[PDB]
């Protein structure tokens, strides 16, 4: 539009701002993170310079596609991390709203009706630490 990349150096800004984990609130992601997802998934579902998304609908589709084919091939914490990051910057990004932590992104994607799969429990836990000296 009126520019080269500001929208783009923008979302990422911002999303900067986005923690992990959720019981934790301390590590952040950065554009390191974010552009490795997105240009990995660019190559797997694309393999092409001029393969990128450039509307909601078509990154939604590439996302969903992302964790589609990845998970029949199987489950890692790359591929995780990469649609976690997709969501994150696409909500901190398009909606230049940044969440706070990686969860809550991929959450009101989802509750919005981005994503096909919605969930109410995806990670936490009580009790935890090392033991007691009695």
Known sequence: ??????DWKM???????????????????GEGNFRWAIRMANVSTG?????IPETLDQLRLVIC???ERRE???????????????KVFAVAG???????????????????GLDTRPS?????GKEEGPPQAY
Do not use: H, W
């Open 120 to 124: 109410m429990k995806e990670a936490g």
């Open 72 to 86: 029949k091939f199987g489950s890692s914490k790359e591929i995780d991390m990469a649609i976690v990051t997709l």
């Open 1 to 6: 539009g009126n520019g080269a990349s500001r």
């Open 47 to 51: 393999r092409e310079p001029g393969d």
């Open 65 to 67: 596609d992302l964790q």
């Open 11 to 29: 979302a990422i800004k911002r999303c900067s701002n986005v923690a992990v984990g959720v019981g934790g609130k301390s590590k952040k992601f």
């Open 94 to 112: 398009l909606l230049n709203m940044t969440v706070s932590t990686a969860a809550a992104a991929e959450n009101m994607y989802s509750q919005m």
